[PDB]
Amino acid sequence: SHMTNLQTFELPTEVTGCAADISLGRALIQAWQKDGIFQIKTDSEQDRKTQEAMAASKQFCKEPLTFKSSCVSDLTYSGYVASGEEVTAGKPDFPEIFTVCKDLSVGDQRVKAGWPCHGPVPWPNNTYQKSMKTFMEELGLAGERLLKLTALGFELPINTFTDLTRDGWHHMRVLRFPPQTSTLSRGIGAHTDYGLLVIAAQDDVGGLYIRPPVEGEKRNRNWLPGESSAGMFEHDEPWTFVTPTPGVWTVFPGDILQFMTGGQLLSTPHKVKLNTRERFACAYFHEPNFEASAYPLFEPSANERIHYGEHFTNMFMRCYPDRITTQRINKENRLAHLEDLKKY
């Protein structure tokens, strides 16, 4: 690996569909179809909000584990996930995570109704809250830009994707990857992201590798059971090292984008190698509304849908089967609410 020098793009503040916007949309699709990644050159305001988000993450992770473990909720999947790095000998590597989902109080009608995954973020403090929320506001504006450009690049109506993302279930993994335990550390294995669009930032430590599309290489459809992408191609070339570069957000298509484009776009496989020092990163998911359904754009004859809320809920239930959030959902039969949603 460590060969390629990826391009960075500036996005316009607004995307209207002029010729330059269409061209940019073409460049975005081509970057994904060739490199699996699209780097956007952020401005000083975008980059100040990234840095303060990282600073809040660093200060929080220095808190004692007892406090950090208290930042959990039984209504939402937002909050702390321990890495287990202190006792990880002979076991896989995991990052230390704080998840930020839509921050909804117990006064919100969806929470009162008992909808799965709806609840308030257990913020460790309000400075952390403000940093993450204003970070994610800027990330969401870029997500909207990118979704309009994507439609333009496929010659679709400019609002094809953004029609699904009003009050979208946007969420973010605030990540700290521990230092390697030895030169033989495996790191976090190959995987694809389950969502629509991923915008990621990282510090200067480095460790993310991604797999570009490979001609003649069949990709699993990770949103289906029996076709998991976990670990696939991890030991096969090529993997592109996502070199840390100041003032850059990296953008990848997720499983949902692969589904909606029928494989014209592929969910970019990721793997993370642990470095000699801790590595801080943020992975922002720009998602459809919890009540929105993805659908195949180019198969007008296949009446197949992926209800996003059910997709998210089933995803986090299976990744955290023992978390209090998952327990409460089963205890109070909160999935019954999803069946009502799906029968619109």
Swiss-Prot record:
Any one Pfam family match given in the protein's UniProt record, by short name: 2OG-FeII_Oxy
EC numbers for this chain: 1.13.12.19, 1.14.20.7
Keywords: Dioxygenase, Ethylene biosynthesis, Iron, Metal-binding, Oxidoreductase, Plasmid
Positions of the Fe2OG dioxygenase domain: 168-288
Temperature dependence: Optimum temperature is 20-25 degrees Celsius.
The UniProt record lists the keyword Oxidoreductase: yes
Cofactor: Fe(2+)
Biological pathway: Alkene biosynthesis; ethylene biosynthesis via 2-oxoglutarate
Recorded GO MF terms: 2-oxoglutarate oxygenase/decarboxylase (ethylene-forming) activity; dioxygenase activity; metal ion binding
Recorded superkingdom: Bacteria
Annotated catalysed reactions: 2-oxoglutarate + O2 + 2 H(+) = ethene + 3 CO2 + H2O; L-arginine + 2-oxoglutarate + O2 = guanidine + L-glutamate 5-semialdehyde + succinate + CO2
pH-related activity note: Optimum pH is 7.0-7.5.
Record text on activity regulation: Activated by catalase. Inhibited by chelating reagents such as EDTA and Tiron (4,5-dihydroxy-1,3-benzene disulphonic acid), and by DTNB (5,5'-dithio-bis-2-nitrobenzoate) and hydrogen peroxide.
The keyword Iron is annotated on this UniProt entry: yes
Residues binding Fe cation, per UniProt: H191, H270
UniProt record, GO biological process: ethylene biosynthetic process
InterPro entries recorded: DIOX_N, IPNS-like_FE2OG_OXY, IPNS-like_sf, Iron_ascorbate_oxido_reductase, Oxoglu/Fe-dep_dioxygenase_dom
Biological function: Simultaneously catalyzes two reactions, namely formation of ethylene and of succinate from 2-oxoglutarate, with a molar ratio of 2:1.
Similarity annotation: Belongs to the iron/ascorbate-dependent oxidoreductase family.
PANTHER family assigned: 2-OXOGLUTARATE (2OG) AND FE(II)-DEPENDENT OXYGENASE SUPERFAMILY PROTEIN-RELATED
Subunit and interaction comment: Monomer.
Protein name: 2-oxoglutarate-dependent ethylene/succinate-forming enzyme
